[PDB]
């Protein structure tokens, strides 16, 4: 039984006339009562005298009157922890919001600092609106980072810096044999699958999802379907995807044969050599202009002026080789037989133990929770509809060419699985002949 403000069982009888049969409950001699608001900025609590007819914006103005009259409060909003909701509709009355004297509100900046661990393992800090839906916050973070197609990325809670321009282009190898082994968590498949409970709800705000101010979230490619991945202008996007692939292989989040590992290692070694090449200085005795340009340029310019023009053009040429090599690494990673599958714990109808539902860009897979061996695959192209029974935490998928599929997940896993299916269905409707026409309204309709 939920109690207090904002429930069906309030502690005080509201809407009582001052001159009624007796005084209103919990009210002063003038009919007002105290609302206590914690102003996070100042670590202080502030009490206000209000009635139920006062507007949310009224409460905000009363707060500002009591605090610094010169300070910028334009970014602050009321946050209601108990009900996990912001109070942005400022014309609502306290009675409309269910707010009585027991309510504990916060007056807090909407924009806060947030630590992100990037796929290249570096930490950055960004200022993001904690009241925007995470879908929009991720889109805004990717724009800051100059990463196109933000709908392929999202935020992931770490399983149990710097303030953006150039750390997004960082791509270096692990420092020590023992720094790498320190990062290697020998993990079974079930424990990898539990990590996927931490993908944030794209339809809710950071504030509603238990994110401390200086808690680090993982910015990660979430959906393994990369639209128009173009070396001519996706340098940052490619570098971060490559880095995600590089670490996933070094850390055995995805398996490969010994011969594949030696190939990925040579390709990483090569990429690191090409990266040294883009910044190797004193490039002097190497450049002999007499061998590189036609003789008319020799006579029209001094050698040290040609050498300079050649070295300036070479910077862009070398970056292109660097990006092409990373593209080749990504393409080999995409060809691994388990690529692109995100695993969730699930009890299949008629099954004996907990197994896995694997979700890929084009299919659902029933898999063994110990070995990851695929048992049964269903194609999205045969899927007609799907639903979640939020009472019994049951996902049911209907098909055109066989009987429905039903499985049970934990409550958290049900929400995440539903957004993955809806998300991949959304991504499949992206059309080459299009502009940045990211139908936000369509993503929300499929994942909520």
């Amino acid at each position: 039984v939920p109690r207090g403000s904002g429930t069906e069982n309030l502690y005080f009888q509201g809407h009582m006339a001052l001159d009624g049969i007796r005084m209103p409950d919990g009210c002063y001699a003038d009919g007002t009562w105290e609302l206590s608001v914690h102003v996070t900025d100042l670590n202080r609590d502030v009490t206000l005298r209000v009635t139920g007819e006062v507007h949310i914006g009224g409460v905000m103005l009363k707060l500002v009157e009591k605090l610094d009259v010169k300070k910028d409060w334009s970014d602050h909003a009321l946050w209601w922890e108990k009900k996990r909701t912001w109070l942005l509709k400022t014309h609502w009355t306290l009675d409309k919001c269910g707010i009585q004297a027991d309510a504990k509100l916060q007056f807090t900046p909407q924009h806060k600092l947030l630590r992100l661990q990037l796929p290249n393992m570096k930490y950055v800090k960004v200022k993001v609106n904690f009241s925007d839906r995470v879908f929009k916050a991720v889109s805004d973070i990717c724009k800051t980072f100059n990463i196109r197609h933000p709908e392929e990325l999202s935020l992931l809670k770490k399983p149990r810096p710097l303030s953006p321009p150039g750390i997004l282009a960082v791509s270096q190898p692990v420092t020590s044999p023992e720094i790498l082994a320190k990062m290697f968590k020998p993990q079974a498949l079930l424990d990898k699958a539990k990590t996927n409970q931490g993908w944030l709800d794209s339809s809710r705000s950071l504030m509603e999802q238990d994110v401390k101010e200086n808690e680090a979230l993982l910015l990660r490619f979430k959906y393994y379907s990369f639209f128009d991945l173009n070396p001519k202008y996706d340098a940052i996007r490619i570098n971060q995807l490559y880095e995600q692939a590089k670490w996933a292989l070094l850390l055995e989040e995805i398996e490969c044969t010994e011969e594949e590992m030696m190939m990925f290692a040579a390709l990483q070694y090569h990429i690191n050599k090409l990266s040294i090449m883009t910044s190797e200085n004193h490039l002097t005795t190497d450049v002999n202009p007499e061998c590189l340009v036609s003789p008319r340029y020799l006579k029209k310019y001094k050698s040290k002026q040609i050498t300079a023009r050649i070295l300036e053009a070479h910077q862009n040429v070398a970056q292109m080789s660097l990006i092409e090599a990373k593209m080749r690494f990504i393409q080999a990673w995409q060809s691994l037989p388990e690529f692109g599958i995100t695993h969730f714990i699930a009890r299949f109808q008629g099954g004996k133990r907990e197994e896995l539902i694997g979700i890929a860009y084009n299919r659902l897979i029933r898999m063994d929770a110990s070995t990851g061996d695929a048992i049964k695959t269903w194609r999205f192209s045969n899927m007609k509809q799907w639903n979640v029974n939020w009472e019994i935490k049951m996902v049911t998928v209907e098909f055109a060419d066989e009987v429905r599929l039903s499985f049970i997940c934990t409550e958290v896993d049900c929400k995440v699985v539903h957004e993955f299916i809806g998300g991949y269905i959304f991504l499949s409707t992206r059309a080459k002949d299009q502009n940045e026409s990211l139908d936000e309204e369509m993503f929300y309709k499929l994942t909520s």
Partner: peptide, 12 residues
């Protein structure tokens, strides 16, 4: 309740 979502491939 339930949240029924139809694959646009089929209807809507």
């Amino acid at each position: 309740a339930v949240t029924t979502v139809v694959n646009p491939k089929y209807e809507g």
